[PDB]
Coordinates of C-alpha atoms and ligand atoms in Angstrom, one line a residue:
Chain L
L1 CA 22.8 -12.8 -9.5
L2 CA 19.6 -12.2 -11.5
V3 CA 20.1 -8.5 -11.0
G4 CA 23.8 -8.7 -11.9
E5 CA 23.6 -7.0 -15.3
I6 CA 21.8 -3.8 -14.2
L7 CA 23.9 -3.7 -11.0
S8 CA 27.2 -3.8 -13.1
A9 CA 25.7 -1.4 -15.7
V10 CA 24.5 1.2 -13.1
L11 CA 27.8 1.1 -11.1
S12 CA 29.7 1.7 -14.4
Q13 CA 27.5 4.8 -15.3
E14 CA 26.5 3.1 -18.6
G15 CA 23.1 2.4 -20.3
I16 CA 21.2 -0.8 -19.7
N17 CA 21.3 -1.6 -23.5
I18 CA 17.6 -1.5 -24.5
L19 CA 17.3 -2.5 -28.2
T20 CA 14.7 0.1 -29.2
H21 CA 15.4 3.6 -30.3
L22 CA 14.6 6.2 -27.6
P23 CA 14.4 9.7 -29.2
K24 CA 16.8 12.3 -27.6
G25 CA 14.9 14.8 -25.4
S26 CA 11.8 12.6 -24.9
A27 CA 10.3 12.3 -21.4
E28 CA 10.2 8.5 -21.8
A29 CA 14.0 8.4 -22.4
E30 CA 14.6 10.4 -19.1
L31 CA 12.2 8.2 -17.1
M32 CA 14.0 5.1 -18.5
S33 CA 17.4 6.4 -17.5
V34 CA 16.4 6.7 -13.8
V35 CA 14.5 3.3 -13.9
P36 CA 17.6 1.0 -13.6
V37 CA 19.2 3.2 -10.9
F38 CA 16.1 2.8 -8.7
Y39 CA 15.9 -1.0 -9.0
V40 CA 19.6 -1.3 -8.1
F41 CA 19.2 1.0 -5.1
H42 CA 16.0 -0.9 -4.1
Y43 CA 17.9 -4.3 -4.3
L44 CA 20.9 -3.1 -2.3
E45 CA 18.9 -1.3 0.4
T46 CA 15.9 -3.7 0.9
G47 CA 18.1 -6.9 0.4
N48 CA 20.9 -5.4 2.5
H49 CA 23.6 -5.9 -0.1
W50 CA 25.8 -2.9 0.7
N51 CA 28.3 -5.7 1.7
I52 CA 28.9 -5.9 -2.1
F53 CA 31.0 -2.7 -1.7
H54 CA 34.1 -3.4 0.5
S55 CA 35.2 0.3 0.2
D56 CA 32.7 2.8 1.8
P57 CA 29.0 1.7 2.1
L58 CA 27.6 5.1 3.2
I59 CA 29.6 7.0 0.4
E60 CA 28.3 4.6 -2.3
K61 CA 24.7 4.8 -1.0
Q62 CA 24.9 8.6 -1.2
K63 CA 26.5 8.4 -4.7
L64 CA 23.4 6.4 -6.0
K65 CA 21.0 8.7 -4.1
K66 CA 22.5 11.7 -5.9
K67 CA 22.1 10.1 -9.3
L68 CA 18.5 9.1 -8.4
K69 CA 17.9 12.8 -7.4
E70 CA 19.5 14.1 -10.7
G71 CA 17.0 11.9 -12.6
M72 CA 14.1 13.4 -10.6
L73 CA 15.1 17.0 -11.5
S74 CA 15.3 16.0 -15.2
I75 CA 11.8 14.5 -15.2
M76 CA 10.4 17.7 -13.6
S77 CA 11.4 19.6 -16.8
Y78 CA 8.5 17.8 -18.6
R79 CA 6.0 18.9 -15.9
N80 CA 3.3 21.5 -16.9
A81 CA 1.8 24.3 -14.8
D82 CA -1.2 22.1 -14.1
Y83 CA 1.2 19.2 -12.9
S84 CA 0.5 17.1 -16.0
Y85 CA 3.4 15.8 -18.0
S86 CA 4.3 16.1 -21.7
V87 CA 6.3 13.7 -23.9
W88 CA 8.2 16.7 -25.4
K89 CA 8.7 20.0 -23.4
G90 CA 6.0 22.4 -24.5
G91 CA 3.9 19.8 -26.2
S92 CA 0.5 18.8 -25.1
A93 CA -0.1 16.8 -21.9
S94 CA -0.4 13.0 -22.0
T95 CA -2.4 10.9 -19.6
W96 CA -0.2 7.9 -20.4
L97 CA 3.0 9.8 -19.8
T98 CA 1.7 11.3 -16.6
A99 CA 0.7 7.8 -15.3
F100 CA 4.3 6.6 -16.2
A101 CA 5.9 9.5 -14.3
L102 CA 3.7 8.7 -11.3
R103 CA 4.9 5.1 -11.3
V104 CA 8.6 6.1 -11.3
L105 CA 8.2 9.0 -8.8
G106 CA 5.9 6.9 -6.6
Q107 CA 8.6 4.1 -6.5
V108 CA 11.5 6.6 -6.0
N109 CA 9.7 8.2 -3.1
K110 CA 10.6 5.1 -1.0
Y111 CA 14.3 6.3 -0.9
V112 CA 14.3 9.9 -2.2
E113 CA 11.2 11.7 -0.8
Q114 CA 9.1 13.4 -3.5
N115 CA 7.2 16.7 -3.2
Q116 CA 4.0 15.3 -1.7
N117 CA 1.9 18.2 -2.9
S118 CA 3.3 17.9 -6.5
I119 CA 2.3 14.2 -6.7
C120 CA -1.1 15.1 -5.3
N121 CA -1.5 17.7 -8.0
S122 CA -0.5 15.2 -10.8
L123 CA -2.9 12.5 -9.4
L124 CA -5.8 15.0 -9.2
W125 CA -5.2 16.3 -12.7
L126 CA -5.3 12.7 -14.0
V127 CA -8.4 11.6 -12.1
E128 CA -10.6 14.7 -12.7
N129 CA -10.0 15.5 -16.4
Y130 CA -9.4 12.0 -18.0
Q131 CA -11.4 9.3 -16.1
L132 CA -14.8 8.6 -17.7
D133 CA -18.0 7.9 -15.8
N134 CA -17.6 4.1 -16.4
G135 CA -14.2 4.3 -14.6
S136 CA -11.9 3.9 -17.6
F137 CA -9.3 6.4 -18.6
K138 CA -8.9 8.4 -21.9
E139 CA -6.0 10.1 -23.6
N140 CA -5.8 13.8 -24.7
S141 CA -7.4 14.5 -28.2
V142 CA -13.5 -4.4 -30.0
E143 CA -10.5 -2.1 -30.7
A144 CA -12.0 0.6 -28.4
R145 CA -12.4 -1.7 -25.4
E146 CA -8.8 -3.0 -25.9
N147 CA -7.5 0.6 -25.9
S148 CA -9.6 1.5 -22.9
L149 CA -8.5 -1.6 -21.0
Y150 CA -4.8 -0.9 -21.7
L151 CA -4.8 2.8 -20.7
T152 CA -6.9 2.1 -17.6
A153 CA -4.6 -0.7 -16.4
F154 CA -1.5 1.4 -17.2
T155 CA -3.1 4.4 -15.3
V156 CA -4.1 2.2 -12.4
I157 CA -0.5 1.0 -12.1
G158 CA 0.8 4.6 -11.9
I159 CA -1.9 5.6 -9.4
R160 CA -1.3 2.5 -7.2
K161 CA 2.5 3.1 -7.1
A162 CA 2.0 6.8 -5.9
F163 CA -1.2 6.3 -3.8
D164 CA 0.3 6.0 -0.3
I165 CA 2.0 9.5 -0.9
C166 CA -1.5 11.1 -1.5
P167 CA -4.3 8.8 -0.3
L168 CA -7.2 11.3 -0.9
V169 CA -10.8 10.1 -1.1
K170 CA -11.2 11.4 -4.7
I171 CA -8.3 9.2 -5.7
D172 CA -9.5 6.2 -3.6
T173 CA -12.8 6.6 -5.4
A174 CA -11.1 6.8 -8.9
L175 CA -9.2 3.5 -8.1
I176 CA -12.5 1.8 -7.0
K177 CA -14.2 2.9 -10.3
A178 CA -11.2 2.1 -12.5
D179 CA -10.7 -1.3 -10.8
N180 CA -14.4 -2.1 -11.4
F181 CA -14.0 -1.2 -15.1
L182 CA -11.2 -3.7 -15.3
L183 CA -13.1 -6.4 -13.3
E184 CA -16.2 -6.0 -15.5
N185 CA -14.5 -5.8 -19.0
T186 CA -11.4 -8.0 -18.9
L187 CA -13.2 -11.4 -19.4
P188 CA -13.9 -12.6 -22.0
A189 CA -10.4 -11.6 -23.1
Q190 CA -9.5 -10.4 -26.6
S191 CA -5.6 -10.6 -26.1
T192 CA -3.2 -12.1 -23.5
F193 CA -1.4 -8.7 -23.4
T194 CA -4.6 -6.8 -22.3
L195 CA -5.5 -9.7 -19.9
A196 CA -2.0 -9.6 -18.4
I197 CA -1.8 -5.8 -17.9
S198 CA -5.3 -5.9 -16.3
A199 CA -4.3 -8.7 -14.0
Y200 CA -1.1 -6.9 -12.7
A201 CA -3.0 -3.6 -12.2
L202 CA -5.7 -5.5 -10.2
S203 CA -3.0 -7.3 -8.2
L204 CA -1.9 -4.0 -6.8
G205 CA -5.3 -3.6 -5.0
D206 CA -7.8 -6.1 -3.6
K207 CA -6.2 -9.6 -4.3
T208 CA -9.3 -11.4 -2.8
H209 CA -11.9 -10.2 -5.4
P210 CA -13.5 -13.2 -7.1
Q211 CA -13.3 -11.7 -10.7
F212 CA -9.6 -10.8 -10.1
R213 CA -9.0 -14.5 -9.3
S214 CA -10.9 -15.6 -12.5
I215 CA -8.8 -13.1 -14.6
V216 CA -5.6 -14.5 -13.1
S217 CA -6.7 -18.2 -13.7
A218 CA -7.5 -17.2 -17.3
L219 CA -4.0 -15.7 -17.7
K220 CA -2.4 -18.9 -16.2
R221 CA -4.4 -21.0 -18.8
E222 CA -2.6 -19.0 -21.5
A223 CA 0.9 -20.1 -20.3
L224 CA 3.5 -21.5 -22.8
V225 CA 5.9 -24.0 -21.3
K226 CA 9.0 -26.0 -22.3
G227 CA 9.8 -29.3 -20.6
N228 CA 7.8 -31.8 -18.4
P229 CA 7.7 -30.6 -15.6
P230 CA 8.1 -27.1 -17.1
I231 CA 11.8 -25.8 -17.1
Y232 CA 10.5 -22.5 -18.7
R233 CA 7.2 -20.7 -18.6
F234 CA 6.2 -17.6 -20.5
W235 CA 3.4 -15.8 -22.4
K236 CA 2.9 -14.4 -25.8
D237 CA 0.6 -11.4 -26.5
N238 CA -2.2 -13.2 -28.5
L239 CA -4.7 -15.8 -27.0
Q240 CA -4.3 -19.5 -27.9
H241 CA -7.7 -19.7 -29.6
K242 CA -7.0 -16.7 -31.8
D243 CA -3.5 -17.9 -32.7
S244 CA -2.7 -21.5 -31.6
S245 CA 0.9 -21.6 -33.0
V246 CA 3.9 -21.7 -30.7
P247 CA 6.5 -18.9 -30.9
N248 CA 10.0 -19.4 -32.4
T249 CA 11.7 -16.3 -31.0
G250 CA 11.2 -13.4 -28.5
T251 CA 9.3 -10.1 -29.0
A252 CA 8.7 -6.9 -27.0
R253 CA 5.0 -7.7 -26.4
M254 CA 5.9 -11.3 -25.4
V255 CA 8.4 -10.1 -22.7
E256 CA 6.0 -7.4 -21.5
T257 CA 3.1 -9.8 -21.2
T258 CA 5.3 -12.4 -19.4
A259 CA 6.6 -9.6 -17.1
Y260 CA 3.0 -8.6 -16.1
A261 CA 2.2 -12.3 -15.5
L262 CA 5.4 -12.6 -13.3
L263 CA 4.6 -9.5 -11.3
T264 CA 1.0 -10.6 -10.7
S265 CA 2.2 -14.0 -9.4
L266 CA 4.9 -12.5 -7.1
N267 CA 2.2 -10.2 -5.5
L268 CA 0.2 -13.5 -4.9
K269 CA 3.4 -15.0 -3.4
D270 CA 3.3 -18.0 -5.9
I271 CA 7.0 -18.8 -5.7
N272 CA 6.9 -22.3 -7.2
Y273 CA 5.0 -21.1 -10.3
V274 CA 7.5 -18.3 -11.0
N275 CA 10.9 -20.1 -11.1
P276 CA 10.5 -21.3 -14.8
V277 CA 9.3 -17.7 -15.7
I278 CA 12.4 -16.0 -14.3
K279 CA 14.5 -18.6 -16.0
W280 CA 13.0 -17.6 -19.4
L281 CA 13.3 -13.9 -18.6
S282 CA 16.9 -14.4 -17.5
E283 CA 17.8 -15.8 -21.0
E284 CA 15.8 -13.1 -22.9
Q285 CA 17.8 -10.4 -21.0
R286 CA 20.5 -8.7 -23.1
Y287 CA 24.0 -7.7 -22.0
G288 CA 23.6 -4.5 -19.9
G289 CA 20.2 -5.7 -18.4
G290 CA 17.7 -4.3 -21.0
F291 CA 15.2 -6.2 -23.2
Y292 CA 13.6 -5.1 -26.5
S293 CA 11.7 -1.9 -25.6
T294 CA 11.0 0.4 -22.6
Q295 CA 7.8 -1.2 -21.0
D296 CA 9.0 -4.8 -21.3
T297 CA 12.3 -3.7 -19.8
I298 CA 10.9 -1.8 -16.8
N299 CA 8.5 -4.6 -15.7
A300 CA 11.0 -7.4 -16.4
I301 CA 13.7 -5.6 -14.3
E302 CA 11.0 -5.1 -11.5
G303 CA 10.2 -8.8 -11.7
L304 CA 13.8 -10.0 -11.5
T305 CA 14.5 -7.6 -8.6
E306 CA 11.5 -8.5 -6.6
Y307 CA 12.1 -12.2 -7.2
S308 CA 15.7 -11.8 -6.0
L309 CA 14.6 -10.0 -2.8
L310 CA 11.9 -12.6 -2.1
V311 CA 14.2 -15.7 -2.6
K312 CA 17.7 -14.6 -1.6
Chain H
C1 CA 20.5 -23.2 -31.0
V2 CA 18.1 -21.2 -28.8
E3 CA 16.9 -24.0 -26.5
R4 CA 14.1 -22.0 -24.7
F5 CA 12.1 -22.0 -28.0
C6 CA 12.8 -25.8 -28.7
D7 CA 9.7 -28.0 -28.0
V8 CA 7.6 -25.2 -26.5
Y9 CA 3.9 -26.2 -25.9
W10 CA 0.7 -24.7 -24.5
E11 CA 0.3 -25.7 -20.9
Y12 CA -3.5 -25.9 -21.3
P13 CA -3.9 -27.1 -24.9
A14 CA -7.2 -26.0 -26.5
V15 CA -7.8 -29.4 -28.1
Ligands
8VH1 C1 18.8 -26.9 -31.7 C2 17.4 -27.3 -32.1 C3 17.0 -27.2 -33.5 C4 15.7 -27.5 -33.8 C5 14.8 -28.0 -32.9 C6 15.1 -28.1 -31.5 C7 14.1 -28.5 -30.5 C8 16.5 -27.7 -31.2

């Protein structure tokens, strides 16, 4: 299976073997510990692969649900009184981290129900204190647009993953405004990374918008391939006209960009286009299931899991 | 030999 590494690693109660250093006691480290447990539960439940266990299906499902629930309680330790989240307990709030927590909790809600009011509070904190008038998001106190495009896309991903839990008009409006910022400022692109994160974020909303389809086509025109017809397909983080070389080895930003390209394409149901992409991702995966860093790892695992549910 | 980086090319070459 494509999801074999994380499945084996989660069932063994071991780490997924991400290469990068995650500082002890950081919110990101705790969020990344629950990440692989969710995608496993999500694969087994949605794909109906409790058959895998020949012992007791109901007992094993409960055992994973407990681990999932223990991860939730740990994440809550980083929550502030205003329902924002901090990277370190007692440190200042981060819009980025709050958006990352909403993505994880929004996804986990599917199988372990979150406190609806708590999620609402976090979403409203995010939208009312850190969205600018132009619809972009800012963090707590050419290069500016790139930073704004990144954080907005990243924040939109978090909001979209938690939206159905708290579909308030203030939040709906914030998404409309944030999506419009991305639609208006993504092309002409400055990097494939920023283009890819914008594309994936927009793919979680209105997939019929004409400028979303131009953004996606611009991303597809940055594709690197091996073979004729392509056996592998992937993306690097810099645009061809800025750096026209071909890469010799993998990087974190390469896997992350590729992952966002994959997730965008799966949301458009483009199953023919994706097979060479998963092939490449499958070979970049390490023993354990992790990749280079946290964000390339989360999105790559999501891509592999959603592909496996769509195809098998 | 890491075959996935052997003979990689741009799918839509600029030139
Ligand atoms: C194994 C190998 C070495 C150098 C180039 C290629 C394409 C393959």
